[PDB]
Amino acid sequence: LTVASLEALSGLLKLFISYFVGIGSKLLDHLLAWAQPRTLQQSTVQIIVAILDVFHLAHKFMNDLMNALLYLENNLPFREPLAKFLDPDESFEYFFNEFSEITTRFVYFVGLDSSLRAKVLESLPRVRGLLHCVRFSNLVDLCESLEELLGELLDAGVCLTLKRSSNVFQVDQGFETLQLLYIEYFKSLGHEKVFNFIDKISKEGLFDDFIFNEKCQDIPTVQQTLDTIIRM
Numbered sequence: 001l002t003v004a005s006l007e008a009l010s011g012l013l014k015l016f017i018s019y020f021v022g023i024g025s026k027l028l029d030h031l032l033a034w035a036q037p038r039t040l041q042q043s044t045v046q047i048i049v050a051i052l053d054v055f056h057l058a059h060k061f062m063n064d065l066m067n068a069l070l071y072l073e074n075n076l077p078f079r080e081p082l083a084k085f086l087d088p089d090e091s092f093e094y095f096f097n098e099f100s101e102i103t104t105r106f107v108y109f110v111g112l113d114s115s116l117r118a119k120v121l122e123s124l125p126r127v128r129g130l131l132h133c134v135r136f137s138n139l140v141d142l143c144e145s146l147e148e149l150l151g152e153l154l155d156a157g158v159c160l161t162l163k164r165s166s167n168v169f170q171v172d173q174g175f176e177t178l179q180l181l182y183i184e185y186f187k188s189l190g191h192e193k194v195f196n197f198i199d200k201i202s203k204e205g206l207f208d209d210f211i212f213n214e215k216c217q218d219i220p221t222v223q224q225t226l227d228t229i230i231r232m
Contacts, residue, residue: 003043003044003047004044004047006044007044007047007048007051008047010039010048010051010052011047011048011050011051011052011055012051014032014036014051014052014055015051015052015055018032018055018056033056033060034060036048036052037060037064037068039052040052040053040064040068040080040083040084041064041067041068041071042068045079045080045083046079046083049079049080049083049084049087050083053083053084053086053087054087065084068080068084069081069084069085073089073093073097076097076105077097077105077109078104078105078108078109081093081109082108082109082112082113085112085113086112086113090110090113090117090121091116091117091120093109093110094106094109094110094117094121103138103139103140106121107139107140107141107142108141110142111140111141111142111143111144111145111146112141112145114147114150115150115151115154118142118143118146118147118150118151119151121142122140122142122143122151122162125138125140126158126162133161134161134162135161135162135165135166136165140166143162143166144166148169148172149171149172149175149176152167152172152176153172153175153176153179156176156180156199156200156203157176157179157180157183157184159195159199159203160195160198160199160202160203163199163203164199164202164203164206167203167206168206168208173204173208173212177200177203177204180196180200181196181200181204181217184196184197184200185197185220185224190232193225193228194225194229197221197224197225200221201218201221205218
């Protein structure tokens, strides 16, 4: 129980005493700032890094960040990089650390902090994770915590499960649903109409229906899909 007492006493005493001179204030501030790197460079990383990093909101930052980031990122890690960086590394850290627990560190570390990393990381998980459901068993935090208008608007016009499961912010749903529904419904062979109508209707029809339907545009998808699918 020394982590809670040491982290709570050091974070509470340093946070409550750091915002209160000459040699005493400079020696106490320099001793606390120089002493926080020894405890943050290695349970107690969340309270120590959160209280120490959020309390006071050049060789010590580069040496502690380079040594802690290189040793913690190369010795595996998500709490040190996410907590120390949240106060080209995504491709090398995610690819090198995931190509050898990888979902939480890769999704939390890569999503806690741009089209190549989001498109390659978000698109490589479907084939790399399904080549051996996906949204419920994977639960990627980068798509929900990071960027959704570019990937959803650029990729919406496989996508029904990630878009419908990850979409459940009015500019992305309105612009992506209106542009994808108008372009897909006006640019018209069964894969494009079935995938666009099922993905747009299933992804756009999921408090959002009562506030967004006040329902008149649902007769075109059911009438065109039911008449075209039943007649064809």
